[PDB]
Amino acid sequence: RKEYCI
Amino acid sequence: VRLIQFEKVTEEPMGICLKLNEKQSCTVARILHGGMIHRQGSLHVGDEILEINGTNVTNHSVDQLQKAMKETKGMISLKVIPNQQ
């Protein structure tokens, strides 16, 4: 799984 | 469906972390401390964002949204839905 901080 | 709007003049992360599940959708996987979303209170960890600035993030590359969000300038409009807090 991945996660993006924006 | 809820249409949230927050102005961003500075070049910096909004204040939240989202990912694209197997279904392909941007949902805040975790709220960051200090961000405008955690401080102002526009979203909550888990909230499902059906649309991000008029674009629905998919399993594909997010760099497109990450860059656009970092290069954006003005009032950001995101389509989010409360997943029961």
Curated annotation (Swiss-Prot), chain A:
It is found in: Cell membrane. Glycophorin-C is expressed in erythrocytes. Glycophorin-D and IsoGPC are ubiquitously expressed. O-glycosylated with core 1 or possibly core 8 glycans. Belongs to the glycophorin-C family. This protein is a minor sialoglycoprotein in human erythrocyte membranes. The blood group Gerbich antigens and receptors for Plasmodium falciparum merozoites are most likely located within the extracellular domain. Glycophorin-C plays an important role in regulating the stability of red cells. This is Glycophorin-C. It comes from Homo sapiens (Human). The gene is GYPC. The chain holds residues 123 to 128 of 128 of the full protein.
From Swiss-Prot, chain B:
Ubiquitous. It is found in: Cell membrane; Cell projection, Stereocilium. The modification Phosphoserine is found at residue 42. Residues 3-84 form the PDZ domain. Palmitoylated. Coiled coil: none annotated. Essential regulator of neutrophil polarity. Regulates neutrophil polarization by regulating AKT1 phosphorylation through a mechanism that is independent of PIK3CG activity. Heterodimer with PALS1. Interacts with DLG5 and NF2. Interacts (via guanylate kinase-like domain) with WHRN (via third PDZ domain). Belongs to the MAGUK family. This is 55 kDa erythrocyte membrane protein. It comes from Homo sapiens. The gene is MPP1.
